[PDB]
C-alpha cells in the first residue's frame with residue numbers, strides 16, 4: 497500500500513467512491529459543460545487582465561491585485577480543464593503521480609484566489625483609514641505581494657504531495673479523495689473557512705467605521721439647523737453639546753484630516769461659551785461660521801469617497817460570491833471524514849461546478865459595477 501505500483505482502482509475501491517470504466521451519459525455532459533466554462537474563464541479573465549494593462553486609470557495597487565485574482569482564475573481554468581479531461585472513465589487511466597497533479601493544481605488555484613482576496617481586504621483596510629491611494633513605492637511593493645500570494649499557493653498545493661497523504665496510511669483514506677488523508681482535509685477545510693471569517697471581520701470593521709463617521713456627520717448637520725432656528729439659550733446649548741460629542745467620536749480612527757476636525761471642535765467650544773454667558777444672537781452667528789468651515793473640506797473628501805465606496809462594494813460582491821459557492825464544498829470535506837453514515841456525499845459534482853463558475857463570475861461582476869472598465873472591454877474586441 498505504502499507507495500506501491502497500484503492503480504487508481506485500488507484506492508477508489510477501498511473507500512466509498514465510484515469508478516467508471518464505460519462512457520456514461522452524464523460523464524459526457526459534465527465534461528462538455530466543464531470545458532465550455534473553462535474556455536470562457538480563460539477568455540473573460542484574460543480580457544480584464546489586458547483592460548488593466550492598457551488603461552491609464554487602472555494603474556493603482558488595488559487594480560493590480562484584481563488582475564492577479566483574474567490570473568488565479570486563469571490558472572484555475574487550466575486546472576479544471578486537466579480535471580475534466582480525466583473524469584469518469586478517464587479517472588481509471590490516471591496514475592498515483594498524475595492524480596496528485598490534477599488535485600494539486602486545483603488546491604494551488606484556490607489558495608491563489610484566497611490569498612489574493614485576503615490581500616485585497618488588507619489593501620481596502622489601509623486606503624479607508626488613509627483616505628486616498630498610495631505612491632509609486634506601493635506599486636513596487638505589490639510585485640513583492642504578488643510573489644508572496646503565488647509562493648503560498650505553490651506551497652499549499654504541494655503540502656499533500658510532500659508526505660501528507662494516506663498513501664502509507666491506507667486505513668485513514670477519505671471517501672471523497674481516495675489518495676488524500678482525512679487529517680489533511682479537516683486541516684485544509686478549517687484553514688480556508690477561518691480565512692473567510694477573518695476577511696468578513698475586515699470588511700465589517702470598514703463598513704462599521706464608515707457608518708460611525710456618517711452618523712456623526714448626520715448629527716453635525718441636523719443640530720446645526722436647530723441653532724439657525726430662532727430659539728432660547730437652552731435650545732442652542734443642547735444642540736452644540738450634541739455636536740461636540742459627535743466631533744470627538746469622529747476624531748477616533750496624512751496629517752490634513754487629523755488636524756482638520758479639531759478646528760471645528762474649537763469653533764463649537766467657542767460658540768458654546770457665548771450661549772453660557774447669555775448671548776444667543778452671537779452663538780447663532782458663531783454656529784453659522786461652522787457651516788462655512790465644513791463646506792471647505794466636502795470638495796476635498798466627499799467627492800472622492802463615492803468613487804472609493806463604489807469600488808469597495810464591488811470587492812465585497814466578488815468575496816460574497818466566493819464564500820456562497822466554496823463554503824458548501826468545504827463543509828462537504830468536513831462531513832466526509834467527521835460525518836460517516838449520517839448522510840451520502842452524492843452532491844459532489846454539483847459543488848465542483850458551483851466553485852468552477854465563480855472563476856467566470858468575477859469579470860461578469862466588474863462588467864456591470866465598474867463604469868470605466870465596462871467601456872475598456874469593448875475597446876480590446878474592436
Ligand SMILES: COC(=O)c1cn(C[C@H](CC2Cc3ccccc3C2)[C@H](O)c2cc(OC)c(C(C)=O)c(OC)c2)cc1CCC(=O)O
Pocket residue numbers: 526579582583584587599602603606672673684822824825826828829844845847848851
Ligand atoms: C469533476 O467532477 C466530479 O464529479 C469530481 C468530484 N470530486 C471530488 C472532490 C470535490 C468535492 C466538492 C467540492 C467543491 C468545492 C470545494 C471542495 C470540494 C470537494 C474534488 O476532488 C476536490 C477536492 C478538494 O479538496 C482537496 C477541493 C478543494 C481545493 O477544496 C476541490 O476543489 C473544487 C475538489 C472529484 C471529481 C472528479 C474525479 C473523480 O472522482 O472521478
